[PDB]
Amino acid sequence: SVLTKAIVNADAEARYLSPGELDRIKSFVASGERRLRIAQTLTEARERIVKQAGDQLFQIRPDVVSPGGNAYGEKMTALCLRDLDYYLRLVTYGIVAGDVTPIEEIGIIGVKEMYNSLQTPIPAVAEGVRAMKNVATSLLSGDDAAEAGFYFDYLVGAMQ
Amino acid sequence: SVLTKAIVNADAEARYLSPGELDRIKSFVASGERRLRIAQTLTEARERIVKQAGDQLFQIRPDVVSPGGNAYGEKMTALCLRDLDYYLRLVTYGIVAGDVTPIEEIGIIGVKEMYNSLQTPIPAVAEGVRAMKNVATSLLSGDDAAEAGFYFDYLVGAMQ
Amino acid sequence: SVLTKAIVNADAEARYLSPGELDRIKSFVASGERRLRIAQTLTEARERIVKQAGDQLFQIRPDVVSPGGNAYGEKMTALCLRDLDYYLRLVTYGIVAGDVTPIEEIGIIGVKEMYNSLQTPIPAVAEGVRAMKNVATSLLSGDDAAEAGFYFDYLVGAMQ
Amino acid sequence: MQDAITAVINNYDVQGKYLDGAALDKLKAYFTTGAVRVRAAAVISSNATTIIKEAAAKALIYSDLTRPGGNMYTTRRYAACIRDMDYFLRYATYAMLAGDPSILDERVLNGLKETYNSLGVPIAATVGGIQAMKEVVGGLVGPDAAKEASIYFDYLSSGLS
Amino acid sequence: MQDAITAVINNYDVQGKYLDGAALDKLKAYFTTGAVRVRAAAVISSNATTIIKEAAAKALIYSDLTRPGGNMYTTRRYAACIRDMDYFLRYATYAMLAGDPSILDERVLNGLKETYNSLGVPIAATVGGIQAMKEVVGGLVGPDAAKEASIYFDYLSSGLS
Amino acid sequence: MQDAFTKAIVAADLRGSFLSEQELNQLTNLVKESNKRLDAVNAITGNAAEIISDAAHKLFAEQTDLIRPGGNAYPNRRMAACLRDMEIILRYVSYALLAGDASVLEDRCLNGLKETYVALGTPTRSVARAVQLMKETAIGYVNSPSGVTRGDCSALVNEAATYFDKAAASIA
Amino acid sequence: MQDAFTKAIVAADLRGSFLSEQELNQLTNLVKESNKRLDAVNAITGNAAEIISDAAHKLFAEQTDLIRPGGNAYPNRRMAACLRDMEIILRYVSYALLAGDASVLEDRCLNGLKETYVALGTPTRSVARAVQLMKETAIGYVNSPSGVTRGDCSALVNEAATYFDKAAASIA
Amino acid sequence: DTDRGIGAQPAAKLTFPLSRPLGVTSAYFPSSQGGAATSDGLEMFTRM
Amino acid sequence: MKTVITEVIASADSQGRFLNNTELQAANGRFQRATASMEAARALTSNADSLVKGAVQEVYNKFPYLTQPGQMGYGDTNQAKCARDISHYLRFITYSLVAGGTGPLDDYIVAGLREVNRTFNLSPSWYIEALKHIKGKVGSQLSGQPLTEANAYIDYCINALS
Amino acid sequence: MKTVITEVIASADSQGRFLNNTELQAANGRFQRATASMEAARALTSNADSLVKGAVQEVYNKFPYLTQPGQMGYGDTNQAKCARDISHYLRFITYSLVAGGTGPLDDYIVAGLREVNRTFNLSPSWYIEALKHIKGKVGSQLSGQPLTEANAYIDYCINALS
Ligand SMILES: CCC1=C(C)/C(=C/C2=NC(=C\c3[nH]c(/C=C4\NC(=O)[C@H](C)[C@H]4CC)c(C)c3CCC(=O)O)/C(CCC(=O)O)=C2C)NC1=O
Ligand SMILES: CCC1=C(C)/C(=C/C2=NC(=C\c3[nH]c(/C=C4\NC(=O)[C@H](C)[C@H]4CC)c(C)c3CCC(=O)O)/C(CCC(=O)O)=C2C)NC1=O
Ligand SMILES: CCC1=C(C)/C(=C/C2=NC(=C\c3[nH]c(/C=C4\NC(=O)[C@H](C)[C@H]4CC)c(C)c3CCC(=O)O)/C(CCC(=O)O)=C2C)NC1=O
Ligand SMILES: CCC1=C(C)/C(=C/C2=NC(=C\c3[nH]c(/C=C4\NC(=O)[C@H](C)[C@H]4CC)c(C)c3CCC(=O)O)/C(CCC(=O)O)=C2C)NC1=O
Ligand SMILES: CCC1=C(C)/C(=C/C2=NC(=C\c3[nH]c(/C=C4\NC(=O)[C@H](C)[C@H]4CC)c(C)c3CCC(=O)O)/C(CCC(=O)O)=C2C)NC1=O
Ligand SMILES: CCC1=C(C)/C(=C/C2=NC(=C\c3[nH]c(/C=C4\NC(=O)[C@H](C)[C@H]4CC)c(C)c3CCC(=O)O)/C(CCC(=O)O)=C2C)NC1=O
Ligand SMILES: CCC1=C(C)/C(=C/C2=NC(=C\c3[nH]c(/C=C4\NC(=O)[C@H](C)[C@H]4CC)c(C)c3CCC(=O)O)/C(CCC(=O)O)=C2C)NC1=O
User: Fold this and answer.
1) Which branch of life, at top level (chains F, G) (predicted)?
2) CB of J145 closer than 6 A to ligand 3?
3) What's the domain count of chain F?
4) Contact call for J22 and I32, based on CB within 8 A
């Protein structure tokens, strides 16, 4: 979280938290209810989001869903949307934690090696995530949509 | 600052800033005008704040200003308030930076060795700082007084 | 410029600028807006000016554009007008600088050797420049037309 | 390193001055542009790889540089070159967030000119790789941030030449 | 060397561009400050000797520098030092007239840091001699010209450090 | 529908506050450049037919397959549809240019357009190209018109380009 | 629809002629007084509700039969229709006033209106009176407003009256 | 378009289609390829 | 959102033609008028705080009984929601001033007004009286065409409530 | 007949609505613009005679063959009806200038144009070339916003014919 990150840096330098570290915990916790609302809205529309991302993806890359494509077929496509459902879930976790610790251990560290083995094209997974940003972001107020958007762009960043 | 701290951690792990790191920069910068007002008020009353800390100090420790005391005499007392003026200045710097980097390099790292040489009683310097908190804090709104208070308690903490 | 020329003479004699040198900088800078207007007008009509210089040239020397002529053919003529476009550009630079430093380093020092290699008849390039003077000069007030004319006659002079 | 804010604090600390009106005005001039810097960094970070690819495509590859005898010939050296490109992009993003070029001197430019002379790395070609990434960046980040991102790419490139 | 105006001409020449609106705006920004630059140069030139004397008095002499063991000990070295001072003043006056620092690089800074290291000439002390002449200059030339003169003294002094 | 002011207002309202002197002056500048904007929109209107025609001539010069049987701009009916779409897109680009905002272009014209063309078998890459050609010529006209006062229109030429580029990107 | 210029143009065309220097300057004068005209139209718009309300209060003060059972402004449904017609007529009078020509009023509002009311049993003389009261109050507001540079706004009024008087005459 | 199969009739088709936000492909660098396209200064002049 | 530019663009789209002169001419008006509009906007913006407190109070001074117990001008929450509501109106007035049309008022306050006020037992009379007061004070913050603009929109709200 | 005034009134009427600040701002554009428009109108009006003879001739100079026997630029009646037709166009241009919109052009020349020209074997190319010529000469009778206005309407006719 913001808490975990602050503390780990504190303990590693053998010291109490800084004024800065204390301030960010305070600003973070003040945004608690708002962050929880952002996760709720997105949890509430998960099935819609995953799907509109999936349409946006297959237009932009009809090949992935083509003879020599990693997601070619009905059940190679079913697993692909399931992976898109996984990452949206992790994005809700990140938003309520206020950093990526959880998102990272669960779904980016090791992701290159996993997908290389499965021969999944990584950059088109990054596209599926942009597609989810676009849908999710259209169900949130301007301010909340930006706050959510940072976590989408992080995942897009880590698959790189 | 908050900026320096965030970036140094970013560069050291060879990466772009986290959602968390970006969020704190945003919350920090939003408090800019407020933090600048807190520094202004205290800069504007600096001479008063020193004098009231100095009275509070000599009541609580009349000995420091006594035959075998580090601050005994008119010019051993003049330098003592000058040191109190130094630390109030550093506290205004810290408040506008949103962390201690500047406060630390300028006036705590090496402070034990400096004062041990001069044979200055460190814990009574910590008292002089508490005394300044009390005065400064009475010239600030509740919310701003707390925000200022964290930086006073840090210095008190570092002389320990 | 006028500045560069004045200064270089100053520095080379290890001295501050003369009253004379200071006066010419003052008279020069007063003509700034006017000189900028002269360059604008000519920049604004560049395509027309080359087309009319090029007609005036081929009447006077139909041979250059003849079997054994340097500019014989459609693309040997295209490059020829492009060179006329180059020199008009340099003339606008010279007018705004108030001397030839720039015009000289860019397009006269080395020009004999360049064109001798290409076997371009130099004196007919000088004619192309006179032709441009005639056109450009018909788009400027009497006073501005003279001021422009000095720089055209310089280029005509240097190709000699 | 230093940022806008610590640049001011250290300039006053050496004079032992409390922050005065002139100082406070400078810091405001930073804070007031802060939100825009953050948004711009998020665009650059999330388009990092595409910026390098479009910058290389306009300014490096399809050339003698990538052919035998060229410095970015071999997969080894091609990899080293776009690795470098990522450094530049990433650090320029730091400089622009900080609103101070000091990090570009401390952690990127110091000794780099001679390092490149010693390996044979073509300086002029590297500058074009920097100014092509700037071009791409300025499109992606928009009116708000274009000028501010741009300057630290220009800092980088006059640091080599 | 280059001045404001030739800086622009050469920047466009390498692109083979006729001067456009952005260029023309830059040149105007120079011409519009031109008369003030001239007046300022006439004040500096005619007070040259007094500026050096007041700058030395505030920042160099009455010190260990002028005493045995000091670098401006001996009439020889005292003469060399105020000779240098005159160079700085004179060239800064050129840079300010030109509205371009390029002459300060070409004819003053290039190799000077190492020249001073090789002779033992104290760099920090020389910078103070530069920033003291700036202080005097800024009084003599007035509101009109103070900021513009000042920058080329600051260019000189960060060129050594 | 939004224009550049309306956009400002919507963002302000989402904060629940008034204009941030920031936004006010951005809009004061739009009013400052509005005569130029009117000339720029007028440049397109005054040459609409030629802009479409010239784009067209050049599109089929490049892609002679479209005018063969089997091609998507054959027979007359299809060519008229293609000429009509060129006009429709140039129209909404001019509207966006008067407005200082792309929304009318995105909402009425670009939204769904790609999927329409794919359903129809209309080659989107060719349509994208026709849009690129309209852009070249349209901007040509914005930059070199009848006795307009001389000044710098590059900011507006860029903005017009992004509207042409939005459309192209959206369609290809 | 006509405005004062359009009217000039139609008469010129019926001669086969470019506008007479006579007609040109009559129209130059309309442009001369157009700020006043805008204030006059604005005076009505800015007080439309009160103009109708005040006319109404006074109409039924005079004609207490309309609000008895048997009366044409009874029950609520009929009163709402009567209030609505007052607004409709005030609206077309303001349009005519912006236009400098009565045609929109005559063509979209007054044409057939009398015969409608007679078919309905609506007492036209009462409707004429309601229009006379709207006129009194409408003309009232324009004269004194807040902070409008002092001058003669007088010439502007008459024309508004003739539009009110057209409507009254047409209906009674 | 009829309801006899359930009787109730279907849930509205266009709600999700109606909602789609505008696709975001920012940055975007254009392409000149394509075929090789003229560059040089000569273009105007040849024309002239 | 109804504004000059938006309206003309919509007209063009419906007609499926081209931004001709009629349209351009109309649009110029909106641009030429921006200076007065935006001066009104800046004055209303910085005085907002006091314009709101002035109008809120005037609602109680004109309807004294509202501030007695059991009434809708009593207790922190009613009086808080009132200030807020007048603040909403002034906010949209400034928006309409900046936008060049009534759009912001039409879309965010007029559409639905009566239904809402009727369900919540809010009398328009209060709001008219808030606005009449705001109109009185804006007489000395502005003059000339900025005042005319401010007035245009204040009156538009009063007529909308009626 | 389309003018800025009629357009805003039409838009108000169709929503059952009084003219508001949006519509009055629009009208101010049309009134502010009248001076340039009417200067163009006066210049086009007094030069009409020669503008017409200039354009008529240019149709024959650009389409030389028209003036040979058996052709449609031959004999007094064709050449007479031509001058008349260009005169009609210039007349409606002046009307559109004075009116503040394209109405006069839309109602009297554009509505029906192609059907008529097609039945009578009249090529638009002639008329475009008449207008292109008129546009060339009007470059030196006017300048600034009067020229822009003249141009707006001449170009409007050329687009109507393409
Ligand atoms: C001797 C060591 C060495 C190699 C191998 C090398 C490869 C190399 N392949 C390239 C492009 C390319 N290479 C391919 C190759 C393929 N496309 C496919 O889908 C297939 C999997 C594959 C063919 C079997 C393609 C399609 C491009 C163009 C990619 C682009 O332009 O974006 C480029 C960039 C173009 C250029 O500037 O030359 C290089 C440098 N360079 C080297 O120095
Ligand atoms: C060993 C070689 C050597 C010499 C000789 C030397 C002289 C010397 N004389 C000085 C000043 C001075 N010297 C004098 C001397 C005189 N006033 C008069 O009118 C008389 C003619 C004369 C006495 C006989 C005075 C008055 C000053 C002060 C001038 C000032 O401060 O402006 C100073 C500047 C003050 C300082 O920083 O020390 C130096 C360096 N420095 C050297 O390294
Ligand atoms: C009927 C609707 C309408 C139009 C069309 C209109 C145009 C218009 N354009 C103007 C200026 C101008 N227009 C331009 C436009 C350009 N400059 C160039 O070099 C480019 C080729 C072109 C780019 C678009 C420039 C540079 C000015 C002068 C600067 C300015 O006023 O902003 C002016 C100010 C007066 C003048 O300087 O002439 C008006 C009134 N006004 C209107 O009411
Ligand atoms: C083109 C614009 C336009 C006008 C002007 C118009 C007039 C008009 N007034 C009507 C009715 C009415 N008009 C009134 C008006 C009045 N009753 C009185 O006693 C007063 C004297 C007077 C009010 C001042 C009443 C009471 C009715 C309803 C008659 C009935 O249904 O019995 C009706 C019949 C349709 C309906 O009731 O909605 C029309 C068409 N309609 C239009 O579309
Ligand atoms: C938003 C649409 C719009 C409006 C409403 C508008 C009004 C407007 N009315 C004006 C003048 C005026 N308006 C009036 C009006 C009156 N004088 C009186 O005493 C009467 C009570 C009233 C009669 C109607 C007068 C007398 C002038 C000054 C003379 C003039 O400019 O013609 C002026 C010129 C500037 C000034 O002197 O204040 C403007 C711009 N302009 C616009 O763009
Ligand atoms: C965006 C534009 C917008 C407007 C204009 C708006 C009006 C508005 N006023 C409301 C309530 C209210 N409005 C008031 C108003 C007042 N109380 C007083 O002391 C005075 C008499 C008066 C101010 C003049 C009161 C007391 C309530 C609480 C009503 C209730 O819930 O019982 C509510 C109900 C939701 C809520 O309780 O907040 C709305 C929607 N809402 C909007 O979104
Ligand atoms: C109110 C606006 C209006 C327009 C614009 C108009 C055009 C027009 N031109 C016509 C004929 C004509 N128009 C021309 C035109 C020309 N002949 C030449 O020498 C040139 C090539 C050319 C002039 C550029 C000719 C020759 C005719 C006679 C056609 C015929 O009856 O065979 C006719 C047929 C009725 C008639 O014979 O007069 C119409 C209606 N009529 C209108 O009422």
Assistant:
1) Bacteria
2) yes
3) 1
4) no
Q: Per the structure block, which two tokens stand in for A79?
A: 């697993």
Contact indicator for C44, F150 with CB cutoff of 8 Å: yes
Is residue B149 within 8 Å of B133, Cβ to Cβ?
yes
- Alpha helices (runs of H) in chain J, residue ranges in sequence order: 4-13, 21-46, 48-62, 75-99, 103-105, 113-119, 124-137, 145-160
Per the structure block, which two tokens stand in for G91?
């609206």
Token representation of residue G88 = 């409709």
Q: What is the CATH number of the domain that holds C22?
A: 1.10.490.20
Distance from C-alpha of F73 to C-alpha of F79, rounded to nearest angstrom: 4
Contacts of A54 (CB under 8 A, 6+ apart): A77, A80, A81, A84, A128, A131
Q: Which amino acid is at F122?
A: T
Residues of D in contact with B92 (CB under 8 A): 18-19
**Cα–Cα distance for residue pair J58/J131, rounded to 1 Å:** 10
Half-sphere exposure of D56 (CA within 13 A, CB side): 20
Amino acid in the structure at residue D38: V
Resolution of the structure, angstroms:
2.8
Q: Which domain holds residue C133?
A: 1-160
Helices (H), chain I: 4-15, 21-46, 48-62, 75-99, 103-105, 113-119, 124-137, 145-161
**DSSP output for A75-117:** HHHHHHHHHHHHHHHHHHHHHHHTSSHHHHHHHTTTHHHHHHH
Q: Which residue has the tokens 């500047």?
A: B102
Please tell me the distance in Å from A74's CA to the nearest CA on chain D.
31
Query: Across the interface, do I5 and F10 touch by the CB < 8 Å criterion?
Result: no
CA count, 13 A, side-chain hemisphere, E131: 13
- Count of structural domains, chain A: 1
CATH class of J1-162: mainly alpha
Work out the number of other CB atoms within 10 angstroms of the CB of residue E144.
Answer: 14
Domain containing G23: what range? 1-172
Instruction: Round to whole Å and give the CA distance between D57 and D77.
Output: 16
Kindly tell me the burial class for residue G131, based on how many C-beta atoms sit within 10 Å of its own C-beta (0-12, 13-18, 19 or more).
buried
Please give the sequence-ordered ranges of beta strands (E in DSSP) within E18-145, or none if there are none.
Answer: none
Ligand 4 centroid–CA G133 distance in Å is 17
Tokens for I88? 């909403």
CATH number of the domain within which G84 lies: 1.10.490.20
Q: What is the DSSP string of B94-115?
A: HHHHTSSHHHHHHHTTTHHHHH
d(CA C51, nearest CA chain H) in Å: 6
Distance from chain centroid for Cα A97: 12
Cα separation, D113 vs D105, whole angstroms = 12
Number of H helices, E strands in chain B: 9, 0
With H, G, I as helix, E, B as strand and everything else as coil, classify residue F166: helix
Domains of chain E: 1-161 (1.10.490.20)
C-alpha count within 13 angstroms, C-beta hemisphere, residue I61: 9
The answer to whether the Cβ–Cβ distance between F14 and A142 falls below 8 Å is: yes
